Design a protein around this nucleic acid. Structure first.
Ligand SMILES: Nc1ncnc2c1ncn2[C@@H]1O[C@H](CSCC[C@H](N)C(=O)O)[C@@H](O)[C@H]1O
Ligand SMILES: Nc1ncnc2c1ncn2[C@@H]1O[C@H](CSCC[C@H](N)C(=O)O)[C@@H](O)[C@H]1O
Lengths: 291, 193, 291, 193
DNA sequence: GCATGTGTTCTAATTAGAACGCATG
DNA sequence: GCATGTGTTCTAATTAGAACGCATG
């Protein structure tokens, strides 16, 4: 573990987020009260960047596509106290029968995280604190999970969002964060049941919903694919504001860029369960300034 | 990396991956005895090799990476060899303090596509050099080399076009080239003969 | 000509809203601070009702299509202290070349407001206060404006939303509200310039935008139909949250019912300029309970 | 409306709109022959008539409305005649305390469509009654009547086939029809003859 | 003097939805 | 012991945009 840091010696956190998505990392960090000195986000989706900048008013330095981040970039933008990211899982998750592993297609982008991580690592003789974390799906080939752990020299911790959210989301988490293996516990404001996430005059058919993907079909529950919501005595699909509350995002977090339903679900389906990331970053507020 | 006096050049300690270079290296005088456990360590499959392995395999002076010679002979994706090579390479580099010269090289037998090529140069922090072995009557054998050997990226090679290289690969469907590639190595370690 | 009412004698307001749309009236009244005792809304658009119910958590009694409201209904639901409504203008506004006028198509729905207004009027000998207001477009055949004034026995005051908003919206207002002809004055919280309504990292090309209709073409400004927003040095159209701010609605007021861009502009296109309605309802605070 | 003894039945003060029935009322014996000059007011274009105009014209015992007979004389939209009739009808109602019987009737010469008819009944708070005015050997006249005259809604007129009446209008392409529905008013007002 | 507008419409892009997929608790 | 899944694809519904319109300050 790292040595505790006297409060006064603590400085703001400098975060390098690769594949930032909709800036979930920055969100949890700010909701935790941690002073964010610098948040360098590597993201290529126009709408994703739009949400991050608009919802956080330009505090995120968007660099670009991760493969064009150089060694000099890491030292100019650095130093970094936290390096986080989750690579695209379209070629790793078992939901796609045509996945291409992590050595072809988009799975390769994992090694960019591995590459930029070692660049960000403090050189020998620099005992300053440094934390990193990598997220990805559980439904990946055992060979891929093996190799990933090989390159990161660490074994993942599986955390299912069901304990703190109203949805199924089982994900592996590599990293060195303090107390990742600790038992996860629910909070007061954690929306644990679908009815807590719905709008007024809507009834929830289930306590929990199945793992949410980019596609609207994952909103229909079970083998029958029934609608999860009833309102006005008519069956209906989830709403975008409700999807956001399921993931723990602020309501209307993805009301940006004139995005419709497919767009907002696409961004939310690939994101992190906010409460899970909060559980992971929680012990960080003992190493950095808070305000 | 400064030059080494001939009398303090100790025998080289090399780590060979995916390809056994014992024959090529010994032919140029780098291994002293018929049995040289310290001189060269060879691994073909690294999927389960950890840093503690390389660390304990004894410090290394050279780390050689090579792709399978051109043929339908490898089940693994071409990028796998480079990613794994880069993974162990970071394991083999000694402490930041430089006690002796540390070298590394990675050769591709015209197996990596342009996508794999750009990822390769990005991860190895340099554009590759091309090693052509052509005597006019033949232009068949060639390989790409990423290496920090100063003489491997200082001398001028027979600069040949990419389409010409693509044609050579389609036509294909080391002794002279890789040896010329390696000669600058024995200016740094013991010459055994 | 309204008898002043001391505060203790004041009781909450009972409002009958016909063609309620997205419950602008209720929004204005509640933002003013008036206790809304009862808000009976006659609306037939599902998404419109979805906004009113969800955004106001069921305080609005939806009845239905106005033509099925009976004299008995007005007596049961009543008494009403305020009757407000704006009839559809698709067959009255000059923007539609094939409009059918006040006596055919949709224009005749005006008379329903007239009809129910007389049902709601206090009977002879009922000195109790009673206010009403009717809104519609300025671009209307003189004969229609004439006849409307004839049936309502009142002449309309025209108020253009530009004085208090960032958009051209000139509308006639028939009614008996206290001080409708008073000078329209801006507030310190009125967003008078388009730049005030835009999101972060968005530049407004214009100070004011033209009258916003249901179709997305009214966002392209001027004869050249230029885009009104520059973002990251690129032309872009207004956003739903920006349209909402232009009108004075709370941001995300129409992030409802999985509605997209076309749907949300369609509801906002026929809505009222909130600050205008606020200027009209303001003197009601001196006739009904407030809290 | 209780009955009024014969010796207290004043002459009618009729307001006639869109159509003049001075000949019909005089024939049946409700209107004096000597010029009042007018115990019956008639207006054709009401677009600019205000409440104080109807009030000024003296209390009205009956308010008559009628669509234009079948033809191309339909200058204005059909619904205009009803909305305007309803508008002036409210102006003519006396104070809530009813000193005398107040009657109204609105007649349509098979001009309004069903979409128009339901608005008519909704605004007149009554379903219309159809006048067959068709002998066994003649079915010429036919009209619809909304009216609060008790007799007009009390007894049984000759039922008709709606499809047939619509067919009579397409084929077209007065006393028995309406004047027969006017006689019951004699009970309430003075009879001149 | 000429741009403006609480819209309908017809067509070209565009989206939603289901078929597809199977190793694994 | 079946149900499940940070997804791609192909089609069938839809959605967006421009032509249309002209009395009027
Ligand atoms: N080459 C690249 N460089 C940087 N980002 C990329 C990239 N290719 C894909 N991405 C982005 O990486 C993201 C991975 S999905 C993960 C999103 C993020 N973890 C969240 O919480 O929302 C996607 O949004 C995708 O747009
Ligand atoms: N027959 C009918 N009965 C009740 N409402 C109707 C109706 N026909 C149309 N409407 C509704 O009347 C509204 C007129 S547009 C006016 C909306 C409202 N003034 C606002 O501020 O938003 C439309 O939303 C339309 O859906």
């Amino acid at each position: 573990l790292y040595p505790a840091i006297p409060a006064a010696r603590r400085r703001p956190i400098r975060v390098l987020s690769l594949f930032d998505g909709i800036a979930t990392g920055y969100l949890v960090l700010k909701e935790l009260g941690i002073k964010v000195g610098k948040y360098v986000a590597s993201e290529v989706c126009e709408e994703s960047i739009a949400v991050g900048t608009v919802k956080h008013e330009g505090n995120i330095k968007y660099v670009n596509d991760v493969r064009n981040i150089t060694k000099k970039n890491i030292e100019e933008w650095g130093p970094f106290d936290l390096v986080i990211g989750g690579s695209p899982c379209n070629d790793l998750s078992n939901v796609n029968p045509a996945r291409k592993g992590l050595y072809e297609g988009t799975g390769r982008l994992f090694f960019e995280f591995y590459h930029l991580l070692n660049y960000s690592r403090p050189k020998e003789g620099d005992d300053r604190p440094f934390f990193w974390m990598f997220e990805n799906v559980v439904a990946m080939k055992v060979g891929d999970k093996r190799d990933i752990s090989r390159f990161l020299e660490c074994n993942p911790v599986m955390i299912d969002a069901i304990k703190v959210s109203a949805a199924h989301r089982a994900r592996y988490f590599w990293g060195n964060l303090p107390g990742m293996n600790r038992p996860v516990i629910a909070s007061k404001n954690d929306k644990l049941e679908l009815q807590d996430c719905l709008e007024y005059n809507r009834i929830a058919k289930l306590k929990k919903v199945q793992t949410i993907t980019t596609k609207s079909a994952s909103i229909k529950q079970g083998k029958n694919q029934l609608f999860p919501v009833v309102m006005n005595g008519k069956e209906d699909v989830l709403w975008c504001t409700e999807l956001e509350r399921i993931f723990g995002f602020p309501v209307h977090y993805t009301d940006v860029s004139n995005m419709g339903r497919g767009a907002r679900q696409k961004l939310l389906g690939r994101s992190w369960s906010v409460p899970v990331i909060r559980h992971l970053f929680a012990p960080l507020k003992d190493y950095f300034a808070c305000e | 990396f400064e030059t080494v006096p001939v009398w303090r050049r100790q025998p080289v300690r090399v780590l060979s991956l995916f390809e056994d270079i014992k024959k090529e290296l010994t032919s140029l005088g780098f291994l002293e005895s018929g049995s040289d456990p310290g001189q060269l360590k060879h691994v073909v499959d690294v999927t389960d090799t950890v840093r503690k392995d390389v660390e304990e395999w004894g410090p290394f002076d050279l780390v050689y990476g090579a792709t399978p010679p051109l043929g339908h002979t490898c089940d693994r994706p071409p990028s796998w060899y480079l990613f794994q090579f880069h993974r162990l390479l970071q394991y083999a580099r000694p402490k930041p303090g430089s006690p002796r010269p540390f070298f590394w090289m990675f050769v591709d037998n015209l197996v990596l596509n342009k996508e794999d090529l750009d990822v390769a140069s990005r991860f190895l922090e340099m554009e590759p050099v091309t090693i052509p072995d052509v005597h006019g009557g033949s232009l068949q054998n060639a390989v790409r080399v990423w290496s920090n050997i100063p003489a491997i990226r200082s001398r001028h090679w027979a600069l040949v076009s990419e389409e010409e290289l693509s044609l050579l690969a389609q036509n294909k469907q080391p002794t002279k080239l890789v040896k010329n590639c390696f000669l600058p190595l024995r200016e740094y370690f013991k010459y055994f003969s």
